[PDB]
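Minutes, project check-in

Agenda point 3 was the complex the collaborators sent over. CS summarized: 14 entities, 2002 residues total, and the question is how they sit relative to each other. Sequences were read into the notes so everyone works from the same version.
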Amino acid sequence: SSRWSKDYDVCVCHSEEDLVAAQDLVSYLEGSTASLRCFLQLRDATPGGAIVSELCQALSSSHCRVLLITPGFLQDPWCKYQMLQALTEAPGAEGCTIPLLSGLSRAAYPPELRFMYYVDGRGPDGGFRQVKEAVMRYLQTLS
Amino acid sequence: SSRWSKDYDVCVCHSEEDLVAAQDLVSYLEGSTASLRCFLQLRDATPGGAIVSELCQALSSSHCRVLLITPGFLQDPWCKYQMLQALTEAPGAEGCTIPLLSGLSRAAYPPELRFMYYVDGRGPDGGFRQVKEAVMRYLQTLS
Amino acid sequence: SSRWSKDYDVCVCHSEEDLVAAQDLVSYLEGSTASLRCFLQLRDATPGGAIVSELCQALSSSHCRVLLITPGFLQDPWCKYQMLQALTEAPGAEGCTIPLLSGLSRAAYPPELRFMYYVDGRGPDGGFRQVKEAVMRYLQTLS
Amino acid sequence: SSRWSKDYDVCVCHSEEDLVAAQDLVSYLEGSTASLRCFLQLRDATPGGAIVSELCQALSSSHCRVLLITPGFLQDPWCKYQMLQALTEAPGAEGCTIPLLSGLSRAAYPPELRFMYYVDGRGPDGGFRQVKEAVMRYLQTLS
Amino acid sequence: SSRWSKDYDVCVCHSEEDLVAAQDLVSYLEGSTASLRCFLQLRDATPGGAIVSELCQALSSSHCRVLLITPGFLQDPWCKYQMLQALTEAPGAEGCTIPLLSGLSRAAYPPELRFMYYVDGRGPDGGFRQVKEAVMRYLQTLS
Amino acid sequence: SSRWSKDYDVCVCHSEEDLVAAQDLVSYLEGSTASLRCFLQLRDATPGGAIVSELCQALSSSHCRVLLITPGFLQDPWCKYQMLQALTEAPGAEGCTIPLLSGLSRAAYPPELRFMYYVDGRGPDGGFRQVKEAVMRYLQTLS
Amino acid sequence: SSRWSKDYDVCVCHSEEDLVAAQDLVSYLEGSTASLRCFLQLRDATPGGAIVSELCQALSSSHCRVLLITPGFLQDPWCKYQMLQALTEAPGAEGCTIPLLSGLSRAAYPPELRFMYYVDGRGPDGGFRQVKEAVMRYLQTLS
Amino acid sequence: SSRWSKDYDVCVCHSEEDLVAAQDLVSYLEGSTASLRCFLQLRDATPGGAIVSELCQALSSSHCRVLLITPGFLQDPWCKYQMLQALTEAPGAEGCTIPLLSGLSRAAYPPELRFMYYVDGRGPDGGFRQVKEAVMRYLQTLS
Amino acid sequence: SSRWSKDYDVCVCHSEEDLVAAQDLVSYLEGSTASLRCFLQLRDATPGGAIVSELCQALSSSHCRVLLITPGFLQDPWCKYQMLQALTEAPGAEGCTIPLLSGLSRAAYPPELRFMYYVDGRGPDGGFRQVKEAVMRYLQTLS
Amino acid sequence: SSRWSKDYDVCVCHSEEDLVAAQDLVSYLEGSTASLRCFLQLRDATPGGAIVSELCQALSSSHCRVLLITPGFLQDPWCKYQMLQALTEAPGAEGCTIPLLSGLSRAAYPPELRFMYYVDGRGPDGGFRQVKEAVMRYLQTLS
Amino acid sequence: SSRWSKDYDVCVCHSEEDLVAAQDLVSYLEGSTASLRCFLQLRDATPGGAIVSELCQALSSSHCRVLLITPGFLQDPWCKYQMLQALTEAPGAEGCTIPLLSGLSRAAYPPELRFMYYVDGRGPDGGFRQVKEAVMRYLQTLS
Amino acid sequence: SSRWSKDYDVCVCHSEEDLVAAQDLVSYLEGSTASLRCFLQLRDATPGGAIVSELCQALSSSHCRVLLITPGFLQDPWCKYQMLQALTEAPGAEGCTIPLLSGLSRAAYPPELRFMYYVDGRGPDGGFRQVKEAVMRYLQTLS
Amino acid sequence: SSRWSKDYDVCVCHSEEDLVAAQDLVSYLEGSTASLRCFLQLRDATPGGAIVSELCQALSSSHCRVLLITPGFLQDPWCKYQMLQALTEAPGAEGCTIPLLSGLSRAAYPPELRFMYYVDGRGPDGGFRQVKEAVMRYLQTLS
Amino acid sequence: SSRWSKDYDVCVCHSEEDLVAAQDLVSYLEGSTASLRCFLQLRDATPGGAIVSELCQALSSSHCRVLLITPGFLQDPWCKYQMLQALTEAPGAEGCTIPLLSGLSRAAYPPELRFMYYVDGRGPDGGFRQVKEAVMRYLQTLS
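CS then shared the predicted structure for the full assembly.
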């Protein structure tokens, strides 16, 4: 194992609209902590594979996972698939699940996710900062 | 053990409305006594865990616990859960329970809590000061 | 309100190890009580559908929750999450929110005893009778 | 006022070690005295409900309190808190507020002797008869 | 919408090892249910035509998908790709999107259990009856 | 085998209109990685053979294959033949299949290909760069 | 002077989280009061235009200011700057300069209480009625 | 001045991916508003001519600019330069200088929000109606 | 010998229901005294051996042995076998026998065991603490 | 001998349905301990031999043997043959016999096997981990 | 219950060295006692059948077990396993569960003496008479 | 009460070295005294049964205890435990609880002399006569 | 970070007319404090970039920013763009905004800027000196 | 690449009249920085090629490009062709575009070029010096 039991340390689950926020969060995570690796579908997924298989890999080969909850995320079925699969694994070692409610401005929260604790506030206003610390506690735990 | 039998020294049980009062009390406690640690859900709880589990941790890993009794606290079910679980542990070592009746202006007091002694007056008017001394007696006791 | 304004009148949260016990208990409720319709994820969750989501919906769309907790239940995380979620759904119980552990030690039950008493004793048959009477009392009081 | 204007006419505060003794004593009261309805947390506190809160409510919503104190009772903190609370509820007794320690040493009883005499002597059977007569005297005087 | 607005009302995704089982299951559906027309690539895909493309079209041009998964199915890549594609076609199921593995171990089924429950149990005959009822429920709900 | 299990490392599947883009991609692939060989029909196919046989050779003697999806590619039946034959071989060793949606400007994607992951963006804007890395992962895998 | 000599008669300073509440409140004012025209930056600030500048202009070009302060408002700096600026625009209030925090704790409100009382209490519906009466009183007194 | 003193009354800056959306929007403007003539580089830039230069001229020789910004637009440098240039042409807007991103996330829009508000919301149809009303308001105010 | 004449220092004899209490006692024993080893059947017994042989090993290879007397322990025949075999060895070196009457709440005591002294009170209320000291006297004796 | 008195170190006795669980267990055993060899019938048995002879070889040339008890295992006569032959050899050197009750969820246990100790819990939930340690004790013993 | 409700009334567990002694003992029981039917694996286990399984079944399907233990018996593992299993079958004896070692030293007997006394003494003939009387006492008490 | 209301009228606690002496003494009692039935573990404890438990039961289920203490008895721990237990069973003697050490030094007898006199002197024959008379006196007084 | 979180420490926002005053201020700032870097467009901006992009860089890569408010500054749209973009960032870390009213001789102040505090007096008469100290407080804050 | 990704480092775009200024600038660039290569048409272009092709080479094989804007440059169509082709490539790697307005004395600037930043002042008066530094930033960037 030696710090990388999983290949990836975090995966940001996000729609095409949410790419700007996701990239800013990933740059913040990867840059601040130096040795962290986030999964982003543009660079870390591989063409020719099935989309579901690449998502299963993103789901299963990462220590932690972040849900950027936005109306684009609510609209997109790939985001729904990631949200549904990350439901029972939230404090787990198979991808700990961190919801960040940036696009709904910390108001609406999916009804199934309710009992699981989430990153409150908006991403730039403290959410990204909270996500990094929350992920870091799991990364230390799973090291 | 060595002064920290419990990870936390105090936990302020309070609603979203009560955050300003809770933060002022926590800053007063943490700053005045230097080495004290309060549990506050924004920083000391971890996303991805269940909310009840994070509350159980806050309840069980703290030497003392403060109930900020306010109409927001009366409204909020998480505050009710903390109040109900802290009922039989009030002078105990599993989180000594200090009620401070700031938001009801020391008038109304929950009917179950009645037989347990509480911090009288309002928080800025002496309640925070009383909470610090009351918690400090328990911290010395449990050191 | 009513005994049967919602889609379901009772719902039993239970493990795949608990199916026989839950079905026998439901047969008493659903036969004895006029117009009663219970949710059981064995029969009421159709293939193709989202069984976890449907059980999550059943907790809030029922007039009564019964939570059957067994040592097999305590080994299944998704079932435990549904039970933990049911506590978040109904902290005031909303009629029934009955933990059932009759014929089983107190140590098995989570520490929610104060505000949510469980079906206690070493008699399993008496536990079913107690739940059946409790369900009738809760439906009568709720209506 | 009345023997039976409130929901309950008698309530017995007692341990889970004391259930047989309390139920036998209640059977004498509830059979002998016309219209009498006693609270026992064994039967009157429904599963799902808040048993500690219901017992707390029973002390004030009863016309009479009997407090059964045994060496098993003195080892249970929540029961002791309910008895201590019962003293806060009824310092003038409000008809019955009877500590029962018949067949047991005086040293066991808390030092409230002056203003709240307990059922004394080495006879257990005579103690039940004394409580039964006392309950009738208190209901007659209260009405 | 309708039970039969589209060209096909049901389609069964299955292997060339599964033809007897799929045809027997379809015979129950297509005989029992009024106006029902199922796609089977055995009969509905004409020679000269593109059988893989026609089966791909059948998944979206059907009102219901049944996915028959067997150990023979799990050895055929084009069939597995059609099943994997069917999940991409209908993540919300669109009435039926039923994985059928009745009389077969859970380990065989891909990890889509949470949001897409499969026909479970050790009874093959009961599985066909469950699919038949499920197809009727899905057509009724869809219409 | 020794790095060349297949004679060719990549084959660009493209129409006569798409030759400029295909040649730029091939020059980029062959030049950047030094020892790579792409199949291009002008130089790597041999006159006197049947066109289908030369395409079968291009399909079967290459480690990877790239689909340049353009309206010329959609129009041309030879491109359709290559696309249809490369459908079930997409992550495989018989010519891994990489779609690049340059001519439709990453908008329209053939309906059958949908479930397979593709190179997003336009060729000069990052698509060629993505194709090289995606092919290189397969070339390392199949070395 | 007049109720309507200026371009706008009321203006509501509020967050993008507060749009529903502000619009509902404005609908009461603008329907009830003859000739009333309110500024809302949702509708009155045209695209292409300077929305912050237009809202800044609306504070001085209105006969009445209502300042809707919510925990979402307190997380938005430009909105807070507009509210802070509104205090600079109208320290004597000029008819309405009403902070609205009805159904919300006093701790949320900035310390301008002495010379600028806010709409207080735990009733949201009563707050709208109080603002509506206050707006009528201010327009009547101003005219 | 006038609604139509210049050669063009509206001009829409948009990508070759955006042609359908821009033409549909223009059809509403050019049909609804009397004497209106819009510049679209699809039709108004003649072959042989300098299309980039003609679009550059159209920004200053129009009474109104609408800037349609899409994720496809954000991938085209010459289009982005024309939009960036349009900001240099009309910082005070000169009637319309409307960024249109309706049905698209805020993160996509360049940080000119304060002094140049964009057409916001998740409704595309409502965005066209908002632009149409805005164009009429700008032409009326400009004249 | 050198402190470990026997391989194990203590063995907790307990039923499946009693595992929570047994584990808490074992964690308390092993953690408090640092170098102690308790036998627990889950980890210290080995599959493939006969259950009686593994129990004989647990009985014979431990310095001391604890009987957790509970109704589950009274029900279970393996617990009866351990109790019967530990009868004549109670102050001995072949597994000194410590009864702790937690589950009967120090009331009922098996009739054969009567003449042997036992740990009084309940486990959390002092019984575990007493067991540790009693075992420690034997461990010092047999060192 | 020198660590390999027997050719194989373990043999997983399992049905065709149980192959996924068996392979995961074998990968866990072979990978974790590095030099271990498990017998699996797909790779370690040789075609052309009689099935009984290959099973006799698997039974007799392995240090240890694991029974995966599942309904598929109960159904299959080859599994019955292995179970029957491994009955009297359970702690022995001719293939020590480890039962793991994964498919019956640790409930039902074959009536003959009863007196032999088994791996409790389910395979992923701790059973595989227990099997590895139990086998390792025998491998150390027989080294 | 009965002396003869089950298939067998007595069963003798014994070695292939013990056949003469067991048959002579059975002849006394089966001749003396009316309706008595004993299991002996010499005669009652038919060829082709599973002799070990049939003897295992005989222990539970008998009203009485006699366990004949000899130095020859102590050299046979399958016989010892059946005797060890018989202890697991009947720890409370269920009428007869008689170890017979008459005319043989105590050291030979396994250490189950306390709760399961063996036929003792140096007389073999007296041992048979003692077993015969014991079998009659056990059948009489059991009935 | 009676000489013979219980199952046994006398019981003799004695060693396996003491069988001849105990049987001879019992023969005098059981022959001389009408209806007398003595417990001797030599004859009254049936094989298969729990001999230690039966002797323990015999002490309380007898009308009289005789405790035969010899230097052989003083070397047997289970016998000494039964004698020590007999003192716990009958401290007031309940008729007979006679230590017999006639023909043996006082130093052999445990120090219970004051409240439990033993059969003293150097005559063994006179001791049996003294016990016989004592048993008759105790049965006569007890009845 | 280490004193330079931003590349520049200050940026003087000024028109072509104001260059003499801006250069004197910059020389005073850079020379007095030694290690400070101001952004001036003549030297610190780069030709070939768009003017807006160079201004965005000047706005975003500087710790602080100075507005030289002059009639030339009021006339120039680039100065308006800088003023408008620096409005909500005035005490912030993204370029703290210091207005110096030199050219209007501290009389006229832009209407939007009013609520933000400014450097009073004229530049040579104390304004430059005040700007240096005000910027230095922010530079110390952001170090 | 290694500092020369492009063959040329700069290209001065200038008319026949502007040759003296261009040569002085080129001598200054080439001489000052030592290893720089500028494209000048007299020496770096090759006769026999088409003039447009030689200009395309000058445009495409140079890291940076300088526009000497003069009335001769405005008159000459070759200069217009270079200016038009260098429009969208101004901060790019395909020839970064630096305008120097020497011949118009920094007054007139082509209307299309307006939004791109330029070298201000006259060439001898600082323009050449500015061009060298601006080009050097790009050369360092593209090294």
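Noted in discussion: The helical segments of chain K are 19-32, 51-60, 77-89, 124-142.
Follow-up: revisit at the next meeting once the mutant set is ready.
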